[PDB]
């Protein structure tokens, strides 16, 4: 029937909105985890490089 198909289309629209919101939030989660793997890979690399440099400065001073 007509309103039968209308209610079925409303259920399909709810499922569509649910899956689109799931895609958006999963993309945001993997994005922020990618930036935290990023910028953490920045911070510890710069810290260890500076530790290596300070060790070389102290060795040549000694």
């Amino acid at each position: 029937s007509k309103l039968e198909a209308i209610l079925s289309q409303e259920v399909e629209a709810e499922i569509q909105a649910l899956l689109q919101e799931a895609e958006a939030k999963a993309e945001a989660v993997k994005r922020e985890a990618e930036e935290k793997a990023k910028a953490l890979l920045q911070a510890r690399e710069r810290a260890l490089e500076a530790q290596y440099r300070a060790a070389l400065r102290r060795a040549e001073s000694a």
Binding site: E4, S8, V11, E12, I15, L18, L19, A22, E23, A26, V29, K30, A33, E34, A37, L40, L41, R44, E45, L48
Partner: protein
């Protein structure tokens, strides 16, 4: 005609269960991907 409404309510509950399992599938693949990224970062950091 009563069986039409019964089958429609049944298959709409089936579609809602399928959408719920799809959302849970999104969540568990995202958790597995975050775990894989943490493992890659830890392995690269240890070798580095």
């Amino acid at each position: 005609l009563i069986k039409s409404l019964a089958e429609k309510e049944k298959q709409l509950l089936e579609r809602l269960e399928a959408a719920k399992k799809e959302a849970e599938e999104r969540v568990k693949r995202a958790e597995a991907e975050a775990k894989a990224l943490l493992e890659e970062a830890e392995a690269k950091a240890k070798a580095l």
